[PDB]
Ligand binder design. Structure first.
Ligand code: DMA
Ligand code: DMA
Ligand SMILES: [Ca+2]
Ligand SMILES: [Ca+2]
Ligand SMILES: [Ca+2]
Ligand SMILES: [Ca+2]
Lengths: 344, 344
């Protein structure tokens, strides 16, 4: 359960914090801020996928130290979110201020010298760096103490892949926005790395790798995550354009305001080339620019006008059905087929 | 030898780059930029300290995979330098442009959209992040394939300490400058984490931990690094104030221009309180501010006027002698006593 996975990470963070007390109260406040960020909210979706990858292949429920290994994905996710807020220059995340604004406010509260925003950015870099090195220390610690050497090697390869692919997905995304990549292929490649592999496939394989040597199941979870991950992305693309702010927690047409290069936006350009070339020109010359609220509503209606919203929904229903068809015929326990079908 | 340690890291980086080719030519260019930065210069000082910590306790020269483990300190150092250049907002490093300026120039070369400086900062964050996750993958890989399980646990604890202390030292340093910490104690605590532990003590213990279980030697290398590391810092403090730009590679009085909170600067304030209170007031009200070249020269002369330079030199000679006295009476091989005395 997510609660048992979070409590394992809570105790670990407490232990690392006590061991670092000799470095002063200022660094202790940064560690406490890391605790408040990781534990103070989240769905725990990635450790749950790792839990089912373990159940799909194993019989005994994982040891408590293995749940700590699954929680490392949550601490690793904090590193990604903290650095992503600097990359996106976001001021808030899920209603709470981002790291660079919390430490800039601390700078002003203490009447410190220099640029508060520069201190906030520097501290946010270090905050994300700490979440990464500590999330990795979990994997190294749990592997040496709780896993047979062959499970250690299988776990490390997944750990090396999930961090290499989330960094590649991040760099591919900023290059795609800077280069104005229109193609569905460019947006799909980012979604495969940032969403399919990072959220679904690699977490699933992390639990399977720790359980036993089942290359057949790991290769199947990759195809299962390739469909469910993209279906998750297209759902977010629709919510990012048409979602009600009372459900998404984000402004109306946020993806259009922020200028994301999404699959939905990319497919709207392709469908518009075939139905109204002037609507494709309206999309091309407006994506990623400073858009008023009226421009955003017009683009939202154009996206649904060319059938991009309906094309996305059918693409979601198809991928979700195939992912469940892949899950029903898998050589795994019927308990994981149920749990993973629930999440899907 | 540093050359054999670098060539191990060169082959590893090449292998990781080839394995990541499926993520496109843009990410491949970032990995090639990482190769050019880590391999295209450096003294390899930290892997050498790790080499002598191995020799001090062991008899057989380390395996080639162990030299790769020692090279992980160099790749980890790239992560620290890349993120430090963002923290310090530096434009060049050792005559070459920093990461945020290389990727901003790429942005302008490609006539890309948006802020080039924001893309450069975002790419620099990701570049440093990649150096860290790959430097850690070396440790995880070498431990599972080349070390007995007890050496793995000893290596991991040093790996967890060196990364936790360089992050704490970085945060303590920006807090010290923002809060205008005058005390020698504040500057010394930063020097112990950033220089003593990160450069000397923890690298030494990394090689000793991989060789055998010698808690006696590891505790001695900590005291040896506590003296040699601070002596290294005070030498840099003197060069940062009085050094010839033709030898330091940095402008005259760079520490005063950049506003570093060094031990030398802190001791100058204490000595001035006892000899000329108005000179201490001149230091206090000028450190960390926008200083003209005449203000810098005046502060340089005041620092030597109150005897802070002479006090630093005697403090360097004392620590260097004690570190060699600690090294001569150590229960280690006479080969490492020679090699480590050379570096000192
Ligand atoms: C690596 C990672 C999880 C990035 C977040 O994606 P995003 O920037 O599109 O959205 P948000 O900042 O809202 O999570
Ligand atoms: C963590 C680390 C090695 C920081 C560099 O020290 P610095 O910022 O005082 O100097 P430089 O940028 O010249 O290396
Ligand atoms: Ca982003
Ligand atoms: Ca973001
Ligand atoms: Ca610095
Ligand atoms: Ca610097």
């Amino acid at each position: 359960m997510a609660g048992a996975i979070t409590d394992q990470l809570r105790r670990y963070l407490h232990g690392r914090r006590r061991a670092a007390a000799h470095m002063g109260s200022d660094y202790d406040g940064l560690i406490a801020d890391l605790e408040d960020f990781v534990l103070g909210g989240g769905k725990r979706l990635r450790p749950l996928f790792a839990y089912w990858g373990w159940h799909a292949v194993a019989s005994r429920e994982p040891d408590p130290d293995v749940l700590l290994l699954f929680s490392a994905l949550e601490l690793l996710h904090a590193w990604a979110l903290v650095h992503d807020d600097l990359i996106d220059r976001s001021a808030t995340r899920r209603g709470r201020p981002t790291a660079q604004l919390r430490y800039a406010a601390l700078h002003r509260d203490r009447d410190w010298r220099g640029s508060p925003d520069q201190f906030g950015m520097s501290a946010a870099i270090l905050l994300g760096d700490l979440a990464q090195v500590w999330a990795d220390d979990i994997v190294s610690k749990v592997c040496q103490s709780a896993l047979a050497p062959d499970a250690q090697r299988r776990v490390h390869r997944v750990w090396a892949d999930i961090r290499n692919e989330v960094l590649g997905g991040q760099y591919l995304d900023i290059v795609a926005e800077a280069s104005a990549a229109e193609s569905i292929e460019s947006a799909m490649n980012v979604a495969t790395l940032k969403t399919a592999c990072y959220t679904v496939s690699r977490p699933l394989q992390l639990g399977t790798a720790a359980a036993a040597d089942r290359s057949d199941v790991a290769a199947i979870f990759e195809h299962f995550g390739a469909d469910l991950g993209v279906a998750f992305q297209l759902r977010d693309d629709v919510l990012g354009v048409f979602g009600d702010p009372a459900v998404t927690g984000k402004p109306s047409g946020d993806d259009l305001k922020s200028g994301k290069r999404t699959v939905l936006v990319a497919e709207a350009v392709e469908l518009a080339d075939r139905s109204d070339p002037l609507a494709a020109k309206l999309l091309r010359t407006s994506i990623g620019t400073r858009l008023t609220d009226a421009q955003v509503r017009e683009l939202r209606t154009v996206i649904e006008a060319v059938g991009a919203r309906a094309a996305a929904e059918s693409r979601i229903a198809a991928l979700t059905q195939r992912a469940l068809a892949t899950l029903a015929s898998a050589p795994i326990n019927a308990t994981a087929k149920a749990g993973l079908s629930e999440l899907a």
